[PDB]
Amino acid sequence: ADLPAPDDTGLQAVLHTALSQGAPGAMVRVDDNGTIHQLSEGVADRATGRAITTTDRFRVGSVTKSFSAVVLLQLVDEGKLDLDASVNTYLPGLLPDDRITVRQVMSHRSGLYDYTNDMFAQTVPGFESVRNKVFSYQDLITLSLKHGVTNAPGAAYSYSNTNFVVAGMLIEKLTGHSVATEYQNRIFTPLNLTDTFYVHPDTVIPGTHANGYLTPDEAGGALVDSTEQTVSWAQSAGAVISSTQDLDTFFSALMSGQLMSAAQLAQMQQWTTVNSTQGYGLGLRRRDLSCGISVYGHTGTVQGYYTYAFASKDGKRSVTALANTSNNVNVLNTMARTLESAFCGKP
């Protein structure tokens, strides 16, 4: 059936709450079948005092995984990739187990250890160590491989950035092009996403953007401006730059069937259980809301930015919410409430 009306007063309260919890700024845009809802509060740059707005560009962090998944699924449509073939079939000698398949990597069922647990054991120090570094995909995979796998191939869900570093490597090996080229040709251009970019390893965010503020691990610590970094530690797992409008366009296009064949979209929605209210497909999350509606999209975390980008099953309603801080669980939990207000409406 259809959805209740979005609750703008509920969205305003969520944003206000997130500010009280430490986010310098927060904003949300809902594309409700052609009627826009847009709210923002707080600052884009806490030093100059410039107010954040829904048109500000930002780092979408892990939402990038959905972009990588779309490219891979289109490669399946073109007959260049088989989801059930071994990763090692395409990238000889990369992984220690030939049984790890592309499907397992896409759904975080590979058992590959997440190298970011080593990199960011200490938040700020970890950020200062990698912010200006450039890594090859192999460098990151090697970091992961210093540890054993955490489970047998396909046995269970374990979120790992390594899986989407592998995805980047696959895209480049099969196409002979950089992932930037593939994103642009396959998604940015066709959808006319004019606020979306993949500029790795450039550290500048093109145009008007919200700055990101990393919260230190110690309570009461001063925020660190984490805006400009290479994001080389994430690449195909987390380096896309976009806007609320473009992510709403992207997820609405994905769910409505415009980005791949119906068969691959169905594959993308084969859910692995994450917890009682969430599933993971192939680079896509499913969140079950209190009113008994499920939404599909992806969350993103990267230093200084928390993103929620979700759409209804048919793509007719899409929401993108952004708080310009990270490493602040209160803010992360409060921002998730945007989904309840946007999709479930007034209580």
mmCIF file of N, CA, C and O in Angstrom, residues 29-32 36 63 67 70 187-196 242-259 309-312 314-320:
data_model
loop_
_atom_site.group_PDB
_atom_site.id
_atom_site.type_symbol
_atom_site.label_atom_id
_atom_site.label_comp_id
_atom_site.label_asym_id
_atom_site.label_seq_id
_atom_site.Cartn_x
_atom_site.Cartn_y
_atom_site.Cartn_z
ATOM 1 N N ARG A 29 16.540 15.723 3.877
ATOM 2 C CA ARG A 29 15.725 16.027 2.697
ATOM 3 C C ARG A 29 14.885 14.768 2.417
ATOM 4 O O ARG A 29 15.408 13.658 2.348
ATOM 5 N N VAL A 30 13.606 14.968 2.252
ATOM 6 C CA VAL A 30 12.682 13.860 1.870
ATOM 7 C C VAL A 30 12.117 14.214 0.498
ATOM 8 O O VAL A 30 11.582 15.277 0.283
ATOM 9 N N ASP A 31 12.229 13.266 -0.450
ATOM 10 C CA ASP A 31 11.616 13.361 -1.768
ATOM 11 C C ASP A 31 10.391 12.408 -1.681
ATOM 12 O O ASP A 31 10.520 11.217 -1.731
ATOM 13 N N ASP A 32 9.214 13.004 -1.446
ATOM 14 C CA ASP A 32 7.983 12.222 -1.251
ATOM 15 C C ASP A 32 7.170 12.237 -2.536
ATOM 16 O O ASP A 32 6.289 13.097 -2.690
ATOM 17 N N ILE A 36 8.770 17.944 -1.933
ATOM 18 C CA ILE A 36 10.008 17.961 -1.164
ATOM 19 C C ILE A 36 9.785 18.440 0.285
ATOM 20 O O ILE A 36 9.028 19.374 0.515
ATOM 21 N N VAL A 63 28.005 4.669 2.251
ATOM 22 C CA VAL A 63 26.922 4.635 1.218
ATOM 23 C C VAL A 63 27.576 4.294 -0.118
ATOM 24 O O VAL A 63 26.961 3.760 -1.024
ATOM 25 N N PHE A 67 27.069 2.135 -4.389
ATOM 26 C CA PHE A 67 27.504 2.545 -5.725
ATOM 27 C C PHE A 67 28.376 1.431 -6.297
ATOM 28 O O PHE A 67 28.196 1.059 -7.461
ATOM 29 N N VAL A 70 26.244 -1.544 -7.400
ATOM 30 C CA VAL A 70 25.521 -1.317 -8.677
ATOM 31 C C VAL A 70 26.451 -1.597 -9.834
ATOM 32 O O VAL A 70 26.005 -2.264 -10.795
ATOM 33 N N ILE A 187 26.636 5.448 -13.483
ATOM 34 C CA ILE A 187 25.699 5.980 -12.537
ATOM 35 C C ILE A 187 25.655 7.518 -12.555
ATOM 36 O O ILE A 187 24.553 8.039 -12.788
ATOM 37 N N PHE A 188 26.743 8.196 -12.341
ATOM 38 C CA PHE A 188 26.672 9.694 -12.221
ATOM 39 C C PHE A 188 26.099 10.362 -13.457
ATOM 40 O O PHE A 188 25.204 11.179 -13.328
ATOM 41 N N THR A 189 26.643 9.991 -14.577
ATOM 42 C CA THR A 189 26.122 10.630 -15.852
ATOM 43 C C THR A 189 24.720 10.270 -16.179
ATOM 44 O O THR A 189 23.841 11.177 -16.343
ATOM 45 N N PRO A 190 24.345 8.982 -16.285
ATOM 46 C CA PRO A 190 22.984 8.613 -16.634
ATOM 47 C C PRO A 190 21.943 9.191 -15.723
ATOM 48 O O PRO A 190 20.805 9.508 -16.174
ATOM 49 N N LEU A 191 22.213 9.328 -14.419
ATOM 50 C CA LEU A 191 21.260 9.866 -13.474
ATOM 51 C C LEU A 191 21.380 11.392 -13.351
ATOM 52 O O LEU A 191 20.601 11.949 -12.568
ATOM 53 N N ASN A 192 22.322 11.993 -14.003
ATOM 54 C CA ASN A 192 22.580 13.424 -13.899
ATOM 55 C C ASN A 192 22.839 13.849 -12.455
ATOM 56 O O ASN A 192 22.232 14.797 -11.969
ATOM 57 N N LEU A 193 23.706 13.101 -11.746
ATOM 58 C CA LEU A 193 24.039 13.426 -10.327
ATOM 59 C C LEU A 193 25.145 14.484 -10.334
ATOM 60 O O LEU A 193 26.361 14.140 -10.217
ATOM 61 N N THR A 194 24.754 15.732 -10.433
ATOM 62 C CA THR A 194 25.733 16.820 -10.555
ATOM 63 C C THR A 194 26.453 17.202 -9.280
ATOM 64 O O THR A 194 27.407 18.034 -9.377
ATOM 65 N N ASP A 195 26.070 16.692 -8.162
ATOM 66 C CA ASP A 195 26.716 16.975 -6.887
ATOM 67 C C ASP A 195 27.533 15.736 -6.395
ATOM 68 O O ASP A 195 28.051 15.779 -5.269
ATOM 69 N N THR A 196 27.636 14.762 -7.291
ATOM 70 C CA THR A 196 28.318 13.488 -6.866
ATOM 71 C C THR A 196 29.664 13.330 -7.493
ATOM 72 O O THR A 196 29.786 13.519 -8.733
ATOM 73 N N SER A 242 28.624 13.401 -2.193
ATOM 74 C CA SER A 242 27.304 13.642 -2.851
ATOM 75 C C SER A 242 26.555 14.694 -2.072
ATOM 76 O O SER A 242 27.086 15.431 -1.260
ATOM 77 N N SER A 243 25.242 14.730 -2.319
ATOM 78 C CA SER A 243 24.305 15.660 -1.693
ATOM 79 C C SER A 243 23.005 14.929 -1.383
ATOM 80 O O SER A 243 22.791 13.799 -1.889
ATOM 81 N N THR A 244 22.162 15.538 -0.556
ATOM 82 C CA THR A 244 20.872 14.889 -0.223
ATOM 83 C C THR A 244 20.053 14.647 -1.499
ATOM 84 O O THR A 244 19.399 13.600 -1.586
ATOM 85 N N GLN A 245 20.023 15.599 -2.401
ATOM 86 C CA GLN A 245 19.250 15.420 -3.635
ATOM 87 C C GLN A 245 19.766 14.264 -4.459
ATOM 88 O O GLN A 245 18.931 13.441 -4.889
ATOM 89 N N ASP A 246 21.082 14.199 -4.635
ATOM 90 C CA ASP A 246 21.625 13.103 -5.475
ATOM 91 C C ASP A 246 21.454 11.702 -4.823
ATOM 92 O O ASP A 246 21.228 10.747 -5.588
ATOM 93 N N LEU A 247 21.644 11.629 -3.518
ATOM 94 C CA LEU A 247 21.438 10.276 -2.914
ATOM 95 C C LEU A 247 19.962 9.911 -3.011
ATOM 96 O O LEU A 247 19.669 8.745 -3.248
ATOM 97 N N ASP A 248 19.040 10.892 -2.870
ATOM 98 C CA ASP A 248 17.602 10.579 -2.986
ATOM 99 C C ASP A 248 17.359 10.097 -4.425
ATOM 100 O O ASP A 248 16.642 9.091 -4.594
ATOM 101 N N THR A 249 17.970 10.734 -5.383
ATOM 102 C CA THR A 249 17.788 10.344 -6.813
ATOM 103 C C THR A 249 18.342 8.929 -6.987
ATOM 104 O O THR A 249 17.648 8.076 -7.607
ATOM 105 N N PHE A 250 19.557 8.716 -6.533
ATOM 106 C CA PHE A 250 20.188 7.408 -6.685
ATOM 107 C C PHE A 250 19.378 6.250 -6.099
ATOM 108 O O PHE A 250 19.112 5.238 -6.788
ATOM 109 N N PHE A 251 18.971 6.378 -4.819
ATOM 110 C CA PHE A 251 18.206 5.242 -4.206
ATOM 111 C C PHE A 251 16.822 5.098 -4.833
ATOM 112 O O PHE A 251 16.343 3.978 -4.936
ATOM 113 N N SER A 252 16.215 6.219 -5.217
ATOM 114 C CA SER A 252 14.892 6.085 -5.864
ATOM 115 C C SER A 252 15.060 5.348 -7.220
ATOM 116 O O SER A 252 14.237 4.439 -7.499
ATOM 117 N N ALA A 253 16.105 5.666 -7.935
ATOM 118 C CA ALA A 253 16.381 5.043 -9.267
ATOM 119 C C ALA A 253 16.685 3.567 -9.053
ATOM 120 O O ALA A 253 16.201 2.712 -9.811
ATOM 121 N N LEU A 254 17.468 3.226 -8.025
ATOM 122 C CA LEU A 254 17.860 1.844 -7.728
ATOM 123 C C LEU A 254 16.581 1.008 -7.449
ATOM 124 O O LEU A 254 16.308 0.032 -8.135
ATOM 125 N N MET A 255 15.778 1.472 -6.477
ATOM 126 C CA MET A 255 14.588 0.716 -6.060
ATOM 127 C C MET A 255 13.523 0.689 -7.153
ATOM 128 O O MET A 255 12.755 -0.291 -7.129
ATOM 129 N N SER A 256 13.451 1.632 -7.995
ATOM 130 C CA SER A 256 12.393 1.644 -9.041
ATOM 131 C C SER A 256 12.798 0.847 -10.240
ATOM 132 O O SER A 256 12.034 0.865 -11.229
ATOM 133 N N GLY A 257 13.996 0.271 -10.244
ATOM 134 C CA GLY A 257 14.471 -0.585 -11.332
ATOM 135 C C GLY A 257 15.217 0.047 -12.426
ATOM 136 O O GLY A 257 15.319 -0.594 -13.539
ATOM 137 N N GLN A 258 15.783 1.233 -12.323
ATOM 138 C CA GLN A 258 16.473 1.883 -13.431
ATOM 139 C C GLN A 258 17.959 1.576 -13.574
ATOM 140 O O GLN A 258 18.521 1.986 -14.624
ATOM 141 N N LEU A 259 18.589 0.925 -12.615
ATOM 142 C CA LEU A 259 20.016 0.777 -12.655
ATOM 143 C C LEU A 259 20.515 -0.610 -13.021
ATOM 144 O O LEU A 259 21.733 -0.758 -13.136
ATOM 145 N N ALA A 309 20.747 7.133 4.113
ATOM 146 C CA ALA A 309 20.131 7.329 2.793
ATOM 147 C C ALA A 309 19.242 6.090 2.531
ATOM 148 O O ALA A 309 19.808 5.001 2.283
ATOM 149 N N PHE A 310 17.912 6.268 2.604
ATOM 150 C CA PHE A 310 16.993 5.133 2.450
ATOM 151 C C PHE A 310 15.780 5.486 1.585
ATOM 152 O O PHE A 310 15.412 6.649 1.464
ATOM 153 N N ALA A 311 15.202 4.486 0.955
ATOM 154 C CA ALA A 311 14.019 4.666 0.110
ATOM 155 C C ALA A 311 13.034 3.539 0.346
ATOM 156 O O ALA A 311 13.383 2.519 0.927
ATOM 157 N N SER A 312 11.799 3.848 -0.014
ATOM 158 C CA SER A 312 10.722 2.824 0.103
ATOM 159 C C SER A 312 10.966 1.788 -1.001
ATOM 160 O O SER A 312 11.735 1.995 -1.963
ATOM 161 N N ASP A 314 9.422 0.818 -3.540
ATOM 162 C CA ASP A 314 9.180 1.205 -4.937
ATOM 163 C C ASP A 314 9.938 2.435 -5.371
ATOM 164 O O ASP A 314 9.747 2.912 -6.512
ATOM 165 N N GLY A 315 10.706 3.005 -4.437
ATOM 166 C CA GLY A 315 11.482 4.191 -4.730
ATOM 167 C C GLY A 315 10.670 5.487 -4.704
ATOM 168 O O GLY A 315 11.241 6.545 -5.032
ATOM 169 N N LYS A 316 9.375 5.440 -4.396
ATOM 170 C CA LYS A 316 8.590 6.693 -4.494
ATOM 171 C C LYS A 316 8.913 7.681 -3.360
ATOM 172 O O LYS A 316 8.734 8.843 -3.647
ATOM 173 N N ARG A 317 9.406 7.175 -2.246
ATOM 174 C CA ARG A 317 9.791 8.130 -1.167
ATOM 175 C C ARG A 317 11.257 7.819 -0.823
ATOM 176 O O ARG A 317 11.548 6.670 -0.591
ATOM 177 N N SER A 318 12.080 8.832 -0.797
ATOM 178 C CA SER A 318 13.507 8.666 -0.449
ATOM 179 C C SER A 318 13.900 9.736 0.571
ATOM 180 O O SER A 318 13.308 10.830 0.582
ATOM 181 N N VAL A 319 14.824 9.406 1.428
ATOM 182 C CA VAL A 319 15.254 10.336 2.493
ATOM 183 C C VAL A 319 16.782 10.235 2.632
ATOM 184 O O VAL A 319 17.299 9.149 2.616
ATOM 185 N N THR A 320 17.361 11.404 2.816
ATOM 186 C CA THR A 320 18.796 11.471 3.083
ATOM 187 C C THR A 320 18.953 12.418 4.304
ATOM 188 O O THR A 320 18.455 13.528 4.187
#
